[PDB]
Structures are given as C-alpha cells and as structure tokens.
Design a protein around this nucleic acid. Structure first.
Lengths: 65, 53, 154, 114
RNA sequence: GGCGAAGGCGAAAACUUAGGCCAUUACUGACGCUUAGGCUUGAAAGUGUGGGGAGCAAAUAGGAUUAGAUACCCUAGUAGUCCACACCGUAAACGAUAGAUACUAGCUGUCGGGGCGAUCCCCUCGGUAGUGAAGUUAACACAUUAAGUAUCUCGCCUGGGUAGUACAUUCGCAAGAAUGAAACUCAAACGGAAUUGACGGGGACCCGCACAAGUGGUGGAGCAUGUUGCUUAAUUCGAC
C-alpha cells in the first residue's frame, strides 16, 4: 500500500523513523522499487531519497547485508 | 548480496539469486554501449514484470 | 521421432535352456543358418567343460554380470567438434554388450581348433581378467573424464 | 588445529582458484586446476573445479577444518559444485559471503568475446 | 516515472536560480503566431590544452584455424578513457508525423495538484500509454497525446545513377560543417504497402535405419560386367 506521507505527520525528517522505513527495504539492504513498496511515486521517491540519505549517513549499508 | 536463511538450505534460496547474478553480471564481464545498457536493462525489467502479472 | 522399442531375442535353445545361449547363437552368428552351427555349439560346450572344467552357464553368467557396462555418452556439439556427457544404462544393454563381447572374442584367437580357441576365450573371460572387463574399466575411467562438462548447462 | 577460518574461492571464467587463508594472515593450502595436472583446456570444465575443491577440502580436513568463512567470486555451477564438494568432504559452511565485484561503471575488462 | 529546447539529467548533502501547473470568483485588457535577419546549444568523435590518466583500447606485435584473417578467440599497445578552457558539429539528433491552438467515439489508465474522504477509492486540471468505433492511407497504424478537420508562421521536394559533386562564398589551423550544381547516361529507382509459394547455415513441430544400438559389411583382393581415358577403320549409339 502507501508507505510514506501516511506513517508520519507530513513533517519529514530522518530521526527515529528509519525503523519504520526498514520494512520498505529488503534484507539485502536494497531499496525496494515502487513495484515492491507499492507506494505512490511521490511517496516512493520520499522512501528512495530517505534511504539513500541514510546510506550516505551509514544508517543502512549500501550493498552490504 | 549475502543471502542466507538456513543452516544448509541457503543454497536452495541462493539458486534463484545465482541466476539473477548471472543475468546482472554478464554486463560486468565486458563493456558495452551505455544507451544499449539502459535499453536492455529497462526492457528486461519490463519483460520480467510483464510475466509476473 | 522414434520412441522406445522392444528388445526381442529368440527363445531359449533347448540344449542349454536359456535365451542367453540363444543370443550367443545369434550374435556369434555368421550369415545365420542353424543347420550346422548348433552341432558346433554342442562341441563348443564340450571343449568348455574339457578345458579347465567350467560349467558354461555359471562362468558365462558371472562374466556377463561383471563385464556389465554402466556408462553411456550423449552428444552435444559446439559446431567445431563434439564432446560427450555421461548417462546411465539399464541391465538390458549391460547383458547385450557382455554377450556381444564374449561372442566376438570367442571367434578370434590363434590355436589349432576353433573349438579350442572359443573354449580358451571362455576360460580367460571366466576370472574377469581383461578380455571384456577392460571395457568395463575403460567406460568407468573415461566417462569420469566426460564428467568434466557434466555440471555445465548450455 | 583449525576448525573455523577463511577460504577464498575464485571461480575464474575458465578455472576456479581455491585457497584457505587464516584471518591472522597465514594460509593453509592452495590448489588450482593446474596444480593437479589438468591445465590448459580442462580447467574451464566444472568438474576440474570440483576436483580442486575436493583436494583443498580433504587436505584442510586432514588439518581438521570443519567449517569456514567462504568469500566466493565468479558465477556459475562451479561456485556451487565447489561448496557441494566441500560439504561432501566434511568441510561444512556457515553461509555464502558476497563482497562480489559489482562495479559502479568502474574499470574496463578486455573487449567482449564476439 | 518525471525535469529541460530536441541534445541531456539518477550515492547523499549544501550553494544561485529555474520554467511550468492547480484554485486564482484577482488584475493591464488581444499585448496572440511568426521567419530570411541574429545567435547559442547540441550525444559522440577528433584536435590543442594543465595536470590527471586505475582500466582497457583506433592503428600495431604476436599466438592459432583459415583460402589469407590487417575481422572474429586471446594478451600487451599509442591517442583517448575527467574537469576548467577553445575549435569542432554531425547522429536511428525520428512520433521516421514542425512550433502553438479549435474541438471531435469509448474503455482502462499512470503520476503530480485540487476536492472528497481512516488510509483507501472516485472525480476533476495538466503530462501521461495501450485498447478500439468512424474517417483516411498502400498498410502499418494515426486514432481524441490523429495521420478527422483546420487555422497563423516558418523550413523542404519536384524520374533517377549522378552528387551534397566542383565552384562563388560563410565558419573552422585543419578535418570537415554551411550553400550548391553542371555534364554523361538509363527508362526506371536494390522505388513503399501487401499476395503467393519458396528459401534459411530464423522458430516450434510430426513421423519416416532418417538418425542412433546393431547384423553383415562394400570400395581393400582374385575374377566378372557397365561406364569413363586412349587408340583404331570402328570398338554402333546414347545415358550422364
């Protein structure tokens, strides 16, 4: 279903919410596409940008499992 | 990359991953044109999702 | 596309009462005609028991069983040459090839009487020394070389 | 002796190089498809890789190695037959480790076989 | 899926700014399209450039089959493999369908905005594809994101091989880019659509000693017979 802009109050950040973004990412530390996440393209790109920011923040490994 | 959920059967789950690695690693064994790279990647993705549904 | 066919062989020869000696009649056969070949086969039995006493039934069955080849080679080419991949065979091919080897090496030796050389071929095929057991050793030692490409799918 | 260490399996495009190494730096054994006398056109055959894997597994099991960390590179049934022969020869595995060479448009290998 | 003129743009973050759209019940009040002028951009690629330059490679050296391999298998190899700076400027730069607009079957849509509303769904404004009515074309299809109907403005084509060829002249050190023939020659274009069987060292396909597992084997040998080569006056003729 819809995975972003519904699990939050429309105020977007990266603190204490990656645990809610984890299940939108396969255990492969890979960003699940809109095909897998199923959210809207706005929310899919929300998830993608947040997860890639977390990767650059060492919150989630890039290609490491 | 690292796929393992069992003590011994992890290779059963890894067979499909190995086929996927074959089809995503035949691109790293030789260089080919970028336009054709994107074309083949997107075409194969659309073909696979077409057969899934 | 041809499918599996029956493996027919003429019924047992009443002198020894098994289809095995009849298949030997049929495969050691030259221009098949059972007018004279049966008397010569009776003599062959005689020379078998006279030389190094061995009941033909038991020695022949032991030789056939031990010589039994197991491996066959299928073909897959690369348009430049051909290679082989090993597969398994049933007991019918095993016994057919064993009888074939015994019969073919029975007719081809060098001593006075042809009866003597067929008897000697039986004797030397008795103890599973190489007259036809070499084929069983060779197939096992060469199909293992064709296992080289066994784990490859193409 | 050793019961848990590191082995680096390199499934070459026409071979498979298997070498058991210690985390501290030393190595236990190394066997190539050629070290057994099957070098030049038979190394590419997966059974040569399986036999090399059997050799390293049996010598390191004589060294006592039950399980091992395995960094396998190269794709195909060679990387599968290697671990199959490892398990058969008593050299068990914990999991497959993949730090595989997936470049992000990196270096250039020699041109494609055309 | 979207952004931007097509070209291009995807690890994250910050810097300056973007066009455009929804509701504008708001406002100047046709200010709307327009090219020859005048430009820049433009994948690549080549040149210089200051360094960088992992990696491999245009030519090349070799090793192999080969009819030979300057192709294809394999490794070295030069420029090049990036930004900052200039020339360069073509492309399957194509929706092979110019910019903008007036609407016009239908269905599902896909996203962004707005409305609604736990989410969600639905509708609506735009981008946004397939399906398919009618019309049209040679058909593909276009098919409401037209190729239906047209509108303002621009650029292009007037049987062909010739030939984007020489030249005037423009840009560029150059290569080339811009523009651009003529002469000779033919009666059509390797002219597009579509039919027919066929072809395939394109695809599945079914059986047939066709293959395979065989039996015996032939051409090997002695002897026959046909034919071929000669040669005769002819070894009648032919078949092939």
């Amino acid at each position: 279903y819809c995975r972003f802009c519904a699990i939050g109050q429309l105020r977007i950040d990266l603190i204490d919410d990656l645990e809610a973004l984890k299940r939108f990412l396969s255990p492969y530390a890979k960003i699940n596409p809109r095909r897998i996440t199923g959210n809207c393209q706005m929310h899919q790109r929300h998830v993608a940008k947040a997860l890639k920011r977390a990767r650059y923040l060492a919150l989630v490994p890039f290609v490491k499992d | 990359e690292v796929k393992n959920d069992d003590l011994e059967l992890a290779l059963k789950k890894f067979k499909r991953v190995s086929l996927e690695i074959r089809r995503l690693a035949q691109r790293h064994e030789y260089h080919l044109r970028k336009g054709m790279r994107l074309r083949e990647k997107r075409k194969i993705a659309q073909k696979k999702r077409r057969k899934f549904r | 596309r041809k499918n599996r066919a029956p493996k027919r062989t003429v019924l047992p020869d009443p002198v020894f009462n098994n289809t095995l000696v009849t298949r030997i009649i049929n495969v050691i056969m030259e221009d098949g005609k059972k007018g004279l070949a049966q008397r010569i086969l009776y003599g062959a039995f005689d020379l078998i028991e006279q030389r190094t006493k061995e009941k033909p039934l038991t020695v022949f069955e032991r030789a056939v069983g031990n010589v039994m080849p197991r491996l066959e080679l299928r073909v897959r080419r690369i348009a430049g040459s051909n290679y082989q991949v090993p597969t398994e065979v049933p007991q019918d091919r095993k016994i057919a090839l064993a009888l074939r080897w015994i019969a073919m090496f029975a007719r081809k030796r060098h001593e006075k009487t042809m009866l003597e050389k067929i008897a000697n071929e039986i004797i030397d095929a008795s103890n599973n020394t190489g007259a036809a057991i070499k084929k069983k050793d060779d197939t096992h030692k060469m199909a293992e070389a064709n296992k080289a490409f066994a784990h490859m799918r193409w | 002796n050793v019961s848990s260490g590191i082995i680096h399996v390199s499934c070459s495009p026409n071979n498979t190089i298997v070498s058991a190494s210690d985390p501290g730096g030393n190595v236990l054994c190394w066997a190539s498809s050629g070290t057994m006398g099957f070098k030049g056109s038979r190394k590419k055959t997966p059974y040569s890789a399986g036999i090399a894997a059997d050799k390293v597994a049996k010598t390191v099991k004589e060294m006592g190695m039950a399980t091992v960390k395995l960094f396998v590179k190269g794709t195909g049934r060679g990387k599968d037959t290697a671990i199959r022969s490892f398990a058969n020869a008593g050299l068990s595995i914990t999991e497959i480790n993949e730090k595989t060479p997936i470049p992000h448009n990196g270096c250039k290998p020699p041109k494609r076989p055309r």
